[PDB]
Each structure stands twice: as structure tokens, then as C-alpha cells.
Amino acid sequence: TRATKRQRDQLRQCFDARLTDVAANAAAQAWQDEYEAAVEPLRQAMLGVLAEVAAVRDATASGLSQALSNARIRFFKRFAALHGNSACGLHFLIQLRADMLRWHKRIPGLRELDEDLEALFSNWFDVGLLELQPITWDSPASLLEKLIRYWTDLRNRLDSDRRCYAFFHPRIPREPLIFVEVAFVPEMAANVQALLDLRRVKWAIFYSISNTQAGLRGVSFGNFLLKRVIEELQREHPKLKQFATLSPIPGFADWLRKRDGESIDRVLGVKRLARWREQHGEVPADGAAWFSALSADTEDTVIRDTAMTLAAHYLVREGGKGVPADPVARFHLGNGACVERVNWGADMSRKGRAQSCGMMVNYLYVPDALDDNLARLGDGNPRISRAVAKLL
Amino acid sequence: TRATKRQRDQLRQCFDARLTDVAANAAAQAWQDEYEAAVEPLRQAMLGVLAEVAAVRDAATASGLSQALSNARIRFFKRFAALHNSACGLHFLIQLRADMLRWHKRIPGLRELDEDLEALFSNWFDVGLLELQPITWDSPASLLEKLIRYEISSWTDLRNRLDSDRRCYAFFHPRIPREPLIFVEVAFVPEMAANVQALLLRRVKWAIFYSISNTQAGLRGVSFGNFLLKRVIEELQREHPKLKQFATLSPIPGFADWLRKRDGESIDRVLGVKRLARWREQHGEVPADGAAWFSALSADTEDTVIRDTAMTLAAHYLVREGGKGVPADPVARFHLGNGACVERVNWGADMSRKGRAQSCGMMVNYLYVPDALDDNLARLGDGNPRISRAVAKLL
Ligand SMILES: [Mg+2]
């Protein structure tokens, strides 16, 4: 407890003093510097002090929880207001959450600080407050090297028949927050290997949307994220009317192998179960066995249909009400999209086959429907196309 | 595919050929070298090939496929554990699982390989097959530096822990010397310890285990058996036939995370009407839920009502929470799964920053009674953990 008492005092001001208090802000400015210029273990230790200070007050039970919540929030608000080596107070806060996130298992007691900040980060970095910028092969190398971490590959993705953007917070230029990759093709894509590999093109397809900030993992950017990109695409090409994605279904395999036989029988239905026995005999004993049976032949029509029905069910009817179990389905469904179609042999990479038997999905975005769909999702009734309803 | 087809062929033999097949073993020997001498991304890629091969069968019913796939993965590991860079085939397998474990999120499709190997590792490294060795300040520095990695960075900490009034051991697999598998730290004191900060020969009567750690990343999650501490006590009794008192001063790491996930209703049921009444009388409002309970129980380390309330919640957590015969707490599961008895809950036992954050600074003593370890191990399978009077009273 040498200088660790100076940091405690500093943090007490940042947590307890009013936002305007010039002294407390000075203290915050001080703590930041000392944190940015510190070895990895020193920071992990400073985080231990922070979770120490955040857990107590320097008096009902309901009033304690509230006072503790209000101080943690006050602590972050003060830092987000300081306009060092990072872009500003808001930026620092992003790196700080990066550490809290990777060291959670080492430094206990940050769960509440992490949850609060994540929630603040959802208001501060809401898409409505972010600026959209086009990214090309002409962009600064120092910027382009932030999208690789989260070069000829970049090139093709950044080519004439391609369009890429990045959302930035106005006061943190240089630091891309979200990276959107778009491809132009004649038909709504059904195989990802084609894309990653302007005359008469009619389809705009989003084949990649990634969060490029570790400190922002888990933060919600709003439901108008792609809506905003489409507006930019229409301004750029008023002739573009067809918008869809060719997304993965990452949590399909892990979900399937957790289901027993009974649940899958209920999903498939009597007719599908019968078509399976007729072609393959024995019905897999459970989900795990189902995954192994559905990966054994990418050519079989019964396997294809069975897998596609299981996939449509997974992304449309699995989740805690209005919240698709699949993260990818949650994002796109949570942006006003419609689950338009399931694609077999869409991603035959090693990873694709391991995540969903190489199955991908197309989420269709219809400008003048995004609102209606966003509503229907809250009712726990995801917007679906005829082809997908037929698989169910 | 320039060479990724050579590894696929190699792996096919290792998975499909008989264990004796000289060619397949050669192939395995080859794949190992190529893996040990490869950049991080190259290995992550080779792991992608492995999960590719493990998911399919070369050139059958559905139940027969799952079995054939299980039998090949098992055959793949058995072949490697039989060979003699790393100490041997078995050792390599340990590092291989180290990568599978840290890259699971990056390289999908290893879940089955990981599960199978973890299960094999439980038979191969069962305590009954491991040799016990004393560790002192005289041990090779190259060995001592494997226990620091897995406890201040100052070797002076190792020193005190490796001193006259202390006794430390390490379990090694006979064919992998140099590589400690488990590290046990023991302290000798006059009274069953109630405060960890203290531990860190003339008239000492208590032998207490204040630390037991797995020193191999590739072995995380593997079960070493229920005779782990039993074996160490035998060594302690051989060494000091006068020692009859054995206990631990363990942490309760998952207490806080469990508590904040409980609603008010569940805690009311745990505490009981009388305790809830004693709480209102002294502190007024009852915390709305578990999260609020944790914040209220951390606000005053001096209050007697807070202490008792927290201790009851703690005893409940480790004795009555878990999927039948399997204590929710990992630390409670290990020690309960070794024949121990939850002997007592200690308030203000670990007042470190971490201690207060994990369990409000509360620690627990698991008592080991040689001629009872079996009986307790049985009672735990019935979902009725062995408990002392003091802990039953908290419940
Ligand atoms: Mg209540």
C-alpha cells in the first residue's frame, strides 16, 4: 500500500465528486496517464484498486446499490468528458474496457464496472451519433491496418465491384468502430467463396460487418446500423434497390449437439422423420449424433433438407422471446431484416462445415419495412420469406 | 493444399490404422515434428485439418458413425501416447491440448477431440499412476520455474513456502520427469488456520494444505482421482508419524458470482425467518436480491449480523448447491471429491483485494480424516456432503 493509496484517493474523487469539480477531473486526468504508462501487471493491479473503490461507499440497502451504481456511472461519465496518447477521455475508456474484459478471470470485482460501461457505450456510440466514412485502397495505411487486426485480400474487398465503410465517433477519428463490407453481384449470393473471390449488377450484399474495438465487444450500436449504410448506397447509386446479406450461422453446431432426440423429432415433424428413415435408416440418437450424420454427405438431398429445416428453426424459433439465440441472427433481425433464405454448401471452408455444415443465410433488407419487422421481432414472430416458412 | 494434403493423409493413418501399424506410427512421429516446428498460425491451421479429419470417416448406420468417429479419435490419441522434442508422445499430447484449449474460439470443431483427450488424460494421469516428489529450495531452478508460472514473482515467496515449517510436493508422470503436474503446498501450525495471510516444528500439530495447483495448461479440467490428498497425507505421516491433524484453508472463488445471480426469494429461503428478522432488526431493509446482498455483506467487516448472514449463505453455497453429488463450487468439488469434510467457514480469512471480491474475505477449512475419506466419498454421491457441527449449525 505504497503509492496504491494515491490511486485510491484519486479514484475516490472520480467516483464521489461532482462532474464539474475541477480537482476531481484533474485527478482523473492523472490516473489515466499513470495507467497508460504502466507495465501489464501494474495495470492489473490498478484495476484491483478500481474494483475495490467501486464496491464500497466512503443508509438503506436499496440506497447502497443505487449509490454504488451512481458512482460507477459518474466515474465513467467524468472520463468520457475529458477532451494524452489516446484520442481523448472517451477513447481511453475504450481501452480500459479492453483490459477489464480480458482480465475478468484474473481481476475479480469488475463485472459491475464492465456492465455499466458497456451500457454507457451503447448510448455514446449509438449509430445515430457515429459518422459513416467510405474505405478504399487509397485510405491511410495506418487506418487500413486497424481493419486487418479486427493485404491483397483487403485489396479485392476494396475494389470497384466492392464497397466498404467504417463508423467512427466524431471525436475519435483514426479509430474505426465498425467495418462493413459490401459486394455487388447480379444475383442474391448463395455461396460466400464467390464473393471473397458495376455494369449490370443489381444486388448489394453485406458479406461482413465487424466490430473493430475490443473495448466495445458486446455493445449495442442501435437498429439503424445497416439502414444508414443503405442510405449511403442509394445516395451513391440511386438505382440500387436490392439489399441482402450472406451471413454465417456460427452457433448452429453448438446448439444442435445440446439437444436430445425428442426435441429434434418435434422440430422435423413426422413426415421429415419418415423421409429420413426411408433414405438413411436409423434416426440419430440425439443432437450430437445428428450433427455427425448431417456432415457425412454434402450431396444427399435428404440430409440437405433435414439440415436446412433444423437451421431455419434454430435462427427463427430459438431464443428468449424477441431475442434470437443466434448472435448473427440477433444483429440482423435487430436491424429490421427478414430471414430470406437458407443456403446449402454456402461456406464449404473448414470453419463453415464446423459451424453449420457449410450452411449460410441471407437476411433481406427492405427499406420500407425495417420498422414493421423490428416490431414483429419484439412480438417474437421474426419476419420470414415463403421459402423459409416452407422449411418449418 | 500444397502440403495440407500430406498432413491429411498422415492424420488419416493415425486415426484409421491399427495401433501396431509401423507406418501409421511413423506418420504420427512425422506430424508431431512438423507441428512442434511451426509458427503459431501454421499450428492453428494444422488443428483445422485435424478437426476436419476427426469429423468424418474414410471409405454405415447413424449409431455406427458416432461410434466409429469416437473410436478413431481415441485411437489417434492412444497412438501418440504410445510413442517415445517434448519428453515423449504423451507429453506432446499435453501441449497439443494446451493449444486446442486456448484456440477453441478460433478453430471450431475441436470440442470432441478435446473432450475425448481430457477423458483419456484422466486415466493416464490418475494419481495412482503418478509419482510424488518433495520440492525444496534445493530443487533445480529449471523445475522451480515451472511452479512460479503456475505467488509473488519474487522467488523469495517460493522460499518461505519452501521452508522448514513448510512442505511442498509435486506429482510427475514417471515418463515425463522435469514436468510437474500438480503442486501441493503445506504449512505446519499449532491451530487449524483461520486466516490465509498468516501462513504466508517443535510443538506444531496441524498440517494444512493452503494451495493445490495444476501446473499444466494442457491438463486444465482433467480429473486426477480422489486419492490425491490421501497420497500426500501418507507421505506426511511417513515423514512425521506424529501428525494426525489434516485440513485445508481453501477459498470459495465462485461465491460472489453465484450470489448476485439469485433473486430475493431464493435468499429468503436460505436464511430462514429468524435470520431475516435478525437482519431487519439490525440493518432495516432486506437487500432486494443477490446482487444487492453482496453489496450489503461487503459494507462492514465488523458487524456480527452481516458476518453470520454471510457465513450461512456461504455454507449453503458450498454444501447445498450443485447438480447432485457435484458441488457447484470447483474448490468444494475438488476437496469434497477427495473425501474431505467441510469443517468450518472463516470470516475475515482472506482480506486481500481478491478475497473480498470473491467471497467477502471468507475462507473454508476442509478436514481430512484418513479413516473416513471413503465413507465421505460415498455420502457425497448421495448428495449429502459430510459436515461438522459448526457448519450444520450455520445451515
Ligand atoms: Mg426480499
Residue numbers in the entry:
A (entry chain A): 58 to 115, 122 to 146, 150 to 216, 225 to 271, 279 to 473
B (entry chain B): 58 to 116, 122 to 146, 151 to 216, 221 to 270, 279 to 473
Which lines from the publication concern this structure?
The MCD monomer contains an N-terminal helical domain involved in oligomerization and a C-terminal catalytic domain. Unexpectedly, the MCD catalytic domain is structurally homologous to those of the GCN5-related N-acetyltransferase superfamily, especially the curacin A polyketide synthase catalytic module, with a conserved His-Ser/Thr dyad important for catalysis. The catalytic domain of MCD contains a central eight-stranded, mostly antiparallel β sheet (β1–β8) that is surrounded by at least 11 α helices (α1–α11).
The two CmMCD monomers associate in a head-to-tail fashion such that the N-terminal helical domain of one monomer is in contact with the C-terminal catalytic domain of the other monomer, including the helical insert between strands β5 and β6. Approximately 1,100 Å2 of the surface area of each monomer is buried in this dimer. There is an insert of three additional helices (α5–α7) between strands β5 and β6 in HsMCD, RpMCD, and AvMCD, while CmMCD has an insert of five helices here. After significant efforts at optimization and diffraction screening, we collected X-ray diffraction data for RpMCD, Agrobacterium vitis MCD (AvMCD), and Cupriavidus metallidurans MCD (CmMCD) at up to 2.3 Å resolution.
